[PDB]
Amino acid sequence: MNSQPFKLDPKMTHKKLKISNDGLQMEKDTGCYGAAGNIFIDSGCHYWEVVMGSSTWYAIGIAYKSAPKNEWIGKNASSWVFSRCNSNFVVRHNNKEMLVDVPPHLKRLGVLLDYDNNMLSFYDPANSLHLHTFDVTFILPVCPTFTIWNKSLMILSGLPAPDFI
Amino acid sequence: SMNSQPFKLDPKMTHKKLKISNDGLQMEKDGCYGAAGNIFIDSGCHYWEVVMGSSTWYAIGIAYKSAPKNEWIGKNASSWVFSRCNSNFVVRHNNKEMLVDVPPHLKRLGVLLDYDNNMLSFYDPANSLHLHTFDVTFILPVCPTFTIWNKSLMILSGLPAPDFI
């Protein structure tokens, strides 16, 4: 795997978000406060995790540059996200959403971007569990996106594929 | 480079009232509640991190096997911990504690066990900041220990040390 490490991009992060000095944590200081990773990916296979804790409302995924800044909740043709709203989990892309069954107490999300094999997959790593795979023939470079309403989020990047993947 | 390997909580060392994720990396309380990592270290240099989130009372460190089970909060000669209790941070060993100046909003603790060079160091990795170093001539192998009185912890093991260390 090619898992390039990355940080949250201060140039692409909503002003209502405070980013840690090491670029791996964000918390709140349309209503959606988005941040983008500081890399674009156009090859290889990459895995990162997000620690969401008790956050009840978020959208995590990837986007083309053709997705406008802070529009990373799967409501255009350039944004793919896994999203939580209370007990309802969906994947969403181009305003089309599909319900995803998730075991209770999801605190950490795994994101597997297999760019070369045209897949974006979401995982519940605590349960070693695949949640959903988008089959996408990517036509532009993609960057990680993280959108929250409140509370906080930490990114675990540059990761080897977990043994169960 | 570091010798850090992935470890998880040892199920046989976990307090009965802790809820543990299936991958052994998350512990939650629904009298301190201690758990120990499933590795005893007697060589090399190791780094792991703990995500504490909103927990206001925890103790994180290492222990010899001679520390009694669940007595991993620095109140014997076999336990070295970094601990938060509300707004006070201390390191504690052999039932003696020293206050530690910690920047606000510590959500993640770095633990650097340099077993070969007889040191245990605690870090605020978000701020690339050294917090405390114990000099310890280790006479037995040591295991990671994690103790909470509320909320939850997540263990980040086997990941590359941050560049600043």
Residue numbers in the entry:
A (entry chain A): 531 to 559, 575 to 710
B (entry chain B): 530 to 559, 576 to 710
What does the paper say about this structure?
The tripartite motif (TRIM) proteins form one of the largest subfamilies of RING-type E3 ubiquitin ligases, comprising more than 80 members. TRIM family members typically contain a RING domain usually catalyzing ubiquitin transfer; one or two B-box domains mediating protein–protein interactions; and a large coiled-coil domain region, which is involved in self-association or oligomerization with other TRIM E3-ligase proteins. About two-thirds of human TRIM proteins feature a PRYSPRY domain, also known as the B30.2 domain, in their C-terminal region. All characterized family members shared the same overall PRYSPRY twisted β-sandwich fold consisting of a 7-stranded and a 6-stranded antiparallel β-sheet.
A characteristic feature of the putative substrate-binding site in the closely related homologs MID1 and MID2 is an arginine located at the C-terminus of β-strand 7 (R587 in MID1 and R637 in MID2) that projects its guanidinium group toward the center of the cavity and two neighboring tryptophan residues lining the pocket. The orientation of the side chain of the two tryptophan residues in MID2, Trp602 and Trp694, showed an intriguing variation in the crystal structures. The MID2 domain was solved in two different crystal forms. In the C2221 crystal form, which contains one protein molecule per asymmetric unit, the side chains of Trp602 and Trp694 engage in π-stacking interactions. In the other crystal form, in P212121, which contains two molecules per asymmetric unit, an alternative orientation was observed in one of the two chains, with the side chain of Trp694 swinging out of the pocket. CASTp analysis detected a pocket with a solvent-accessible (SA) volume of 56 Å3 in chain A but only a much smaller subpocket at this site in chain B (SA volume = 1.8 Å3).
